[PDB]
Each structure stands twice: as structure tokens, then as C-alpha cells.
Design an enzyme around this catalytic site. Structure first.
Site, PDB file in Angstrom:
ATOM      1  N   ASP A 131       0.837  -1.175   0.000  1.00 25.81           N
ATOM      2  CA  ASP A 131       0.000   0.000   0.000  1.00 25.81           C
ATOM      3  C   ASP A 131       0.881   1.238   0.000  1.00 25.81           C
ATOM      4  OD1 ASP A 131      -2.439   1.328  -0.157  1.00 25.81           O
ATOM      5  OD2 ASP A 131      -2.872   1.202   1.997  1.00 25.81           O
ATOM      6  N   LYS A 133       2.043   4.696  -1.036  1.00 25.46           N
ATOM      7  CA  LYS A 133       1.366   5.845  -1.632  1.00 25.46           C
ATOM      8  C   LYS A 133       1.691   7.074  -0.773  1.00 25.46           C
ATOM      9  CE  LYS A 133      -2.946   4.839   0.854  1.00 25.46           C
ATOM     10  NZ  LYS A 133      -4.449   4.853   0.756  1.00 25.46           N
ATOM     11  N   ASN A 136       0.713   7.379   2.815  1.00 27.65           N
ATOM     12  CA  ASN A 136       1.470   6.497   3.721  1.00 27.65           C
ATOM     13  C   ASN A 136       2.960   6.787   3.846  1.00 27.65           C
ATOM     14  OD1 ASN A 136      -0.501   3.468   3.061  1.00 27.65           O
ATOM     15  ND2 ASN A 136      -0.784   5.151   4.506  1.00 27.65           N
ATOM     16  N   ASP A 149       1.887   2.380   7.835  1.00 25.92           N
ATOM     17  CA  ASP A 149       0.730   1.581   7.383  1.00 25.92           C
ATOM     18  C   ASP A 149       1.140   0.164   6.994  1.00 25.92           C
ATOM     19  OD1 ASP A 149      -2.060   1.328   7.108  1.00 25.92           O
ATOM     20  OD2 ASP A 149      -2.058   1.697   4.969  1.00 25.92           O
ATOM     21  N   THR A 171      -4.536   0.270  -2.629  1.00 22.17           N
ATOM     22  CA  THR A 171      -5.328   1.457  -2.975  1.00 22.17           C
ATOM     23  C   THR A 171      -5.380   1.492  -4.493  1.00 22.17           C
ATOM     24  OG1 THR A 171      -4.692   2.647  -0.981  1.00 22.17           O
ATOM     25  CG2 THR A 171      -5.399   3.991  -2.844  1.00 22.17           C
TER      26      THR A 171
HETATM   27  N1  LIG Z   1       3.434   8.067  13.496  1.00 21.17           N
HETATM   28  C1  LIG Z   1       2.580   9.025  13.094  1.00 21.17           C
HETATM   29  N2  LIG Z   1       2.871  10.340  13.255  1.00 21.17           N
HETATM   30  C2  LIG Z   1       2.035  11.307  12.842  1.00 21.17           C
HETATM   31  N3  LIG Z   1       0.862  11.043  12.238  1.00 21.17           N
HETATM   32  C3  LIG Z   1       0.444   9.768  12.027  1.00 21.17           C
HETATM   33  C4  LIG Z   1       1.298   8.658  12.443  1.00 21.17           C
HETATM   34  N4  LIG Z   1       0.646   7.519  12.116  1.00 21.17           N
HETATM   35  C5  LIG Z   1      -0.524   7.869  11.515  1.00 21.17           C
HETATM   36  N5  LIG Z   1      -0.635   9.217  11.466  1.00 21.17           N
HETATM   37  C6  LIG Z   1      -1.772  10.000  10.908  1.00 21.17           C
HETATM   38  O1  LIG Z   1      -2.995   9.391  11.306  1.00 21.17           O
HETATM   39  C7  LIG Z   1      -3.768   9.015  10.167  1.00 21.17           C
HETATM   40  C8  LIG Z   1      -4.558   7.758  10.483  1.00 21.17           C
HETATM   41  O2  LIG Z   1      -3.658   6.669  10.531  1.00 21.17           O
HETATM   42  P1  LIG Z   1      -4.209   5.187  10.823  1.00 21.17           P
HETATM   43  O3  LIG Z   1      -3.036   4.262  10.572  1.00 21.17           O
HETATM   44  O4  LIG Z   1      -4.891   5.179  12.177  1.00 21.17           O
HETATM   45  O5  LIG Z   1      -5.347   4.918   9.716  1.00 21.17           O
HETATM   46  P2  LIG Z   1      -5.203   5.103   8.107  1.00 21.17           P
HETATM   47  O6  LIG Z   1      -4.297   4.029   7.586  1.00 21.17           O
HETATM   48  O7  LIG Z   1      -5.048   6.572   7.780  1.00 21.17           O
HETATM   49  O8  LIG Z   1      -6.692   4.786   7.569  1.00 21.17           O
HETATM   50  P3  LIG Z   1      -7.302   3.341   7.192  1.00 21.17           P
HETATM   51  O9  LIG Z   1      -6.947   2.394   8.326  1.00 21.17           O
HETATM   52  O10 LIG Z   1      -8.777   3.671   7.101  1.00 21.17           O
HETATM   53  O11 LIG Z   1      -6.663   3.024   5.850  1.00 21.17           O
HETATM   54  C9  LIG Z   1      -2.731   8.859   9.060  1.00 21.17           C
HETATM   55  O12 LIG Z   1      -3.302   8.971   7.759  1.00 21.17           O
HETATM   56  C10 LIG Z   1      -1.740   9.957   9.387  1.00 21.17           C
HETATM   57  O13 LIG Z   1      -2.171  11.238   8.904  1.00 21.17           O
END
Ligand SMILES: Nc1ncnc2c1ncn2[C@@H]1O[C@H](COP(=O)(O)OP(=O)(O)OP(=O)(O)O)[C@@H](O)[C@H]1O
Ligand SMILES: O=C(O)/C=C(/CCc1ccc(Cl)cc1)c1ccccc1
Length: 285
Positions: A131, A133, A136, A149, A171
């Protein structure tokens, strides 16, 4: 001893996923800042999402590299699961593409090189991201990349010389043709996504664009895309060597003899690979 929710002061929400919330937290005993990803147990059990959560933990536990979000700790309470992650202060690469529109060649080269360096490490551990992109690829306070991710990542088994994985994840804009046609992904599937990302850095949009998934799929399998005018010639050559339908013919894949030939592409002529994570990234534009 595992950490506990009471060991932290929680602050702002950093982002929300389908099944998760990421919150800024300060550890009370140390004053360290973490991005803590929290999931509700009942919710993930009811939504059959548990193997995504265990996959994320398992894959991230294997990683130790400057260009990946680091998993420092996990814990749980009665209702919730918590991942303690490094905080990527500057957020998603995608938003920089949108605001600036299109990276210049030096910025494209730098960020592409960091992604290449990350993928070389990941593939060397036998892991496919699946994934990859801009959403991520996060950025730390110093503007280095932090790839995230890993719930949809796959550890390939060395024991069986496993090359292909069968879960249908990713995606639409970045999914590889082999996943659409052969119904499996391989390490080279990430190089396809890399090609889409390099294209997007320069052009502003990924190459296979449409208002819905099915139309995107139909374009992917036909390699239906074209370059805008003014696309940097060396980047164009590189994209054409990555956006190849045959997964065994992509620059950087095992059948093309790996990352050495990829890193040697003329687009990366100026790059010092060895110390990328200590270099000051070029100012965006
Ligand atoms: N280590 C980190 N530091 C800062 N921001 C983060 C971090 N990890 C995730 N984020 C932010 O939080 C958002 C949500 O992340 P999360 O992994 O909870 O779900 P997602 O992968 O965005 O969505 P989905 O699970 O629906 O595909 C991310 O898109 C990013 O903007
Ligand atoms: O790593 C741990 O401390 C234990 C778990 C517990 C494993 C688990 C998975 C799912 C559910 Cl419903 C309950 C418990 C965990 C797994 C992933 C992320 C954070 C914590």
C-alpha cells in the site's frame, strides 16, 4: 513491564483511520512525545479486523530503519489496543504535493531516493508493503520520510522461498497489474507503486486516474497513461522502467538483479546513498 494509558498525557488527534485514531501523547516519566494509535477491541472484533492489527504489530516489530515509522511499544487495557509510534510531525507527503502542485527535480530525486532506500531495506527483509502511496509516506520534523501503514504488509516466508502473496489489499490508484490479473502481489508490486509515486511528484497526479476504481483498474491493465509536457527526461525514463506490466521486468526487482541497477539509474547520478538520512533535505518547491 508494559506501559499503561495512565503513563501518558494525551493531546490532539493526529489522524483517523476506518478502525483507529492516532493521538499525540507525552509520556509522563520521560516527557517523550509519541503518536499513539488506538483501536477499540469490540469494534475490531465485530468488524473482523483483528488480523490487520496483529499483522501491523508483527511487521513493524521487524523493522529498524530511519525511513520507517518505529513501533516502540504496544499495550492494551480492557477496551483498547495501543501502538506507541514515532511522531512524524510534518504529516503526510500527499499534502505537500497538493499545496505545491509539483516537486522540482532535486526534491523529486531526494524523496525518490529515500523511498528507494526504504524499499531496498524492506525487500531485503522479505517484506512487501502493498500500500505504498503518498498518504502512507509521512515526514518527520527534519523532513525525512517515515513510511507507515503495515497492517496490509506481508512478510514473505524465507523457508518456502515465497515470492507471491494472495490477500487482495492496497489502494486502487497504486495497485499493480499482477494483483488485478494474477490475483497476487510480489516485492515488484511495490516498484510499480514507486513508479506511480515518482510520476505523481512531478505531474501532480498519479498516472492512472479516474472517478472510480473499476475505471482505474481497466487503465492499469492496459498501461493506459501518458506524460505531461515538461516531465524531467531522466525521471520519465525511470518511470517507464517501473510502470511495466510484466512484474519481472521492473527496474529493481529480483529478476532484474535488485537494487544496484535501480540505484545506478541516471536519475540518481547526484545521490549519495550512504548518508541520506543525515543529509539536509532540499527545501520544497
Ligand atoms: N506516526 C505518526 N505520526 C504522525 N501522524 C500519524 C502517524 N501515524 C498515523 N498518522 C496520521 O494518522 C492518520 C490515520 O492513521 P491510521 O493508521 O490510524 O489509519 P489510516 O491508515 O489513515 O486509515 P485506514 O486504516 O482507514 O486506511 C494517518 O493517515 C496519518 O495522517
Ligand atoms: O502487543 C501487546 O501488548 C498485545 C496486544 C494484544 C493482542 C490482541 C489483539 C486483538 C484483541 Cl481484540 C485483543 C488482544 C496488542 C496487539 C496489537 C497492538 C497492540 C496490542
Amino acid at each position: 513491564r508494559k506501559k499503561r494509558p495512565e503513563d501518558f498525557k494525551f493531546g490532539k488527534i493526529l489522524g483517523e483511520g476506518s478502525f483507529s485514531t492516532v493521538v499525540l501523547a507525552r509520556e509522563l516519566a520521560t516527557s517523550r512525545e509519541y503518536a499513539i494509535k488506538i483501536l477499540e477491541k469490540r469494534h475490531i472484533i465485530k468488524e473482523n479486523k483483528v488480523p490487520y492489527v496483529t499483522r501491523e504489530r508483527d511487521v513493524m516489530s521487524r523493522l529498524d530503519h530511519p525511513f520507517f515509522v518505529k513501533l516502540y511499544f504496544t499495550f492494551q487495557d480492557d477496551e483498547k489496543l495501543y501502538f506507541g509510534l514515532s511522531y512524524a510531525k510534518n504529516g503526510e507527503l500527499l499534502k505537500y504535493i497538493r499545496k505545491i502542485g509539483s516537486f522540482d527535480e532535486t526534491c523529486t530525486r531526494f524523496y525518490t531516493a529515500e523511498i528507494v532506500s526504504a524499499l531496498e531495506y524492506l525487500h531485503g527483509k522479505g517484506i512487501i508493503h502493498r500500500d505504498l502511496k503518498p498518504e502512507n509516506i509521512l515526514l518527520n520534523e527534519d523532513m525525512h520520510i517515515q513510511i507507515t501503514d503495515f497492517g496490509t504488509a506481508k512478510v514473505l516466508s524465507p523457508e518456502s522461498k515465497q515470492a507471491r502473496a494472495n490477500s487482495f489489499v492496497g489502494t486502487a490508484q497504486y495497485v499493480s497489474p499482477e494483483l488485478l490479473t494474477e490475483k497476487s502481489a510480489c516485492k515488484s508490486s511495490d516498484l510499480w507503486a514507486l513508479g506511480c509515486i515518482i510520476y505523481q511528484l512531478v505531474a501532480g497526479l498519479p498516472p492512472f486516474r479516474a472517478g472510480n476504481e473499476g475505471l482505474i483498474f481497466a487503465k492499469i491493465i492496459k498501461l493506459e497513461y501518458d506524460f505531461p509536457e515538461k516531465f524531467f527526461p531522466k525521471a520519465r525514463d525511470l518511470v517507464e522502467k517501473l510502470l511495466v506490466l510484466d512484474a519481472t521486468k521492473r527496474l529493481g526487482c529480483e529478476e532484474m538483479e535488485g537494487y544496484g541497477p535501480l540505484k545506478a539509474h541516471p536519475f540518481f547520478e547526484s545521490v549519495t546513498w550512504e548518508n541520506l538520512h543525515q543529509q539536509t533535505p532540499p527545501k520544497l518547491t
